[model samples]
Target chain A: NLPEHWTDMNHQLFCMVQLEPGQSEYNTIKDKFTRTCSSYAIEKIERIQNAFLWQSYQVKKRQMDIKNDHKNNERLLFHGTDADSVPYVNQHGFNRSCKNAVSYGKGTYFAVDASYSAKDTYSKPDSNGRKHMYVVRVLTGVFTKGRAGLVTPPPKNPHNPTDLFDSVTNNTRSPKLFVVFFDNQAYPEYLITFTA
Target chain B: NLPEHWTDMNHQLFCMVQLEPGQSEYNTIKDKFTRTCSSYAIEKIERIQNAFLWQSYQVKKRQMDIKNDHKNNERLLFHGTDADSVPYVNQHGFNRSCAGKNAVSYGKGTYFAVDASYSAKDTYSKPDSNGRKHMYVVRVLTGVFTKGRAGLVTPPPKNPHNPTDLFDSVTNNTRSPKLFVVFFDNQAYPEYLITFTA
Candidate 1:
């Protein structure tokens, strides 16, 4: 076979490009991180370029239509991850297996504002006293408020139960956060290392 | 969450318990493998007893039945995986994201078969240094199948006009087709492993 890359997405391999201050990538991520709280200082930022992950996300992204999602409702969110777990999340993307119970729902959790995930309950420091958080691109399409053990979001219509909600949120009308049970609903774009 | 009879299969991680010729589990698998082929001899048969895998499959099964009313046309089929990919396939289940690239002549989906000898070649994984090769007897939920096309990513709708309800799977032939395909992950579970010499 020829030396090849996936034509599926960006046609590139998964690589990390470490961004520094004064660089636009660094400044942009810093702005997002410090929007809610400035308690943590940025050590470094790396742009995550997972090609297969992007392809998986695109598969879900293309499935949405004008009927179900008028705006696409895409947003950048935060996910505080463990030091050891950071690499796994970067390579394999989020593990939305829904194997555990949680407050809002039993799926991968994310934060609308960085301050929420910056808490110790979410972002535990590593052996070197550094914390890792990902600025993930999420598709929050047609979501409803989630309950304690929601497997998948309930059907939007009782008459037609197959038409289920796309995701589950903390609040319906004015949503603060959400969780997605599907594997391809989000993609991690940047990993921000910081110290409190 | 394990009984003593099947305790050896689970530890801190995955394990395989060899089935003997006299044991019913071994005999059953041996027959299943040799049902269509009489030439190849069995080296060993092992039941892949994973407690965690069973739990996940149960959840998937429940979801499948409730979601689309597909009662999980459950059948034990064979899938040939590479020697390099075996560990990951066992640990995390089959990767449906990589489904389209498989031997997808019938359709772009994960392919499974009813015959062992059909997948015991270089197309999947060949015989190792000692002439030993491996294949899995998986639990496939081939609910219903239509004739598969080349570029199909999802199952075709039950009707041409309405897209709400779709076929569960695709196959080579609508009438008694042996080749089965599924697009979604967790549609199949790796149940047993057969290690044999060609």
Candidate 2:
């Protein structure tokens, strides 16, 4: 029955983890922390507490993958096109605190790793036409547990090496992607959505 | 071709990337680029252009495993004690980048989705203060390709939710781990390296 301040905030979060009964990792962490939060030395207490709780939980972890940076930037590529980003197909935004919405600070984007299209090459440059051969598409959104709700880097045009430098220099966060898109004379609109 | 604006100024900075024949990715990129560059877009074709090439060839697609944020941050927490902070761990900067190294930029502290940590009540008040027990070690630095290479984030301290605040906020081309490390009384000096890879 130690005070709330005795344990870090994660303790509260895990209090809601609600793992199944036979969950070994969960039991181990809960047991360890449940037994160590009352010592006079706060540091050791916290360390033991964290070591137990933070052990790399060997669960099925996942993240949205991006192949063509501009095309499937928001979804997982190669894994499956249906799981990538598709244009005008499945799109919607979610409100924060929606219980299901993963909080990116305050709010989040609710589209799944949808799909879109990419061009192979451009013969006749269309001023106002759409000419992409590689199509990016994905299923809508779904909720799952564990570390599956991950996003990739932004869709910065890394056409040249210096562009990487500029992108990195002007980076609000690290640039984690290198994109290549193919457009033809049919369609020239930039329809890529850079999500995670 | 787009027209000739060829100069030999800082062109040497680029190194040509060579790919094996059967290699699916890098070679495809090279082939695609060579084919496109053959078109009439630029002005000058020049001396069979060759420059340093950064390829998505070695680029292995991976996800930011925010779930391992705890252990990853532990490695970074060791940063304050990891090395003497010099040319030691030259691959990456201990306190974020000052020189802005290239290859190790991927190794710096960058985060995507930082999984939060939970701290619950226990009884023993664990006091194995060998910098072992009472320390909340986090492997805040993790990547899919390399061990402890990608960016890290630590959870905030046991305080009110600073929605926009992380335990450590290192931004820019590198991500700062948001999670915090709750070390015991006086044992935050072990300099342990927390590493994880795919």
TM-score of every prediction relative to native: 0.51, 0.17
| Minimal lDDT window, size 10, model 1 chain A | A1-10
lDDT of 2 by residue, A110-193 (tens): 221112111112111134332211112221112122122222111234442112110111112332111211100011111221
Expressed as tens digits, the lDDT of each residue in B161-193 for candidate 1 is 655356878888888777788766656788877
User: Which is the leading candidate under lDDT?
Assistant: 1
Q: After superposition, how far is residue A60 of candidate 1 from its true place, in Å?
A: 0.6
Q: Which candidate's DockQ is highest?
A: 1
Q: List the residue pairs that clash in candidate 1.
A: none
Q: How accurate locally, in lDDT, is each candidate? A: 0.71, 0.22
Error of 1 at A175 (Å): 1.7
Worst 10 residues of 1 chain B by lDDT: B6-15
On the 0 to 100 scale, the lDDT of residue B135 in model 2 is 17
The alpha-carbon lDDT assigned to residue A170 of candidate 2 equals 14
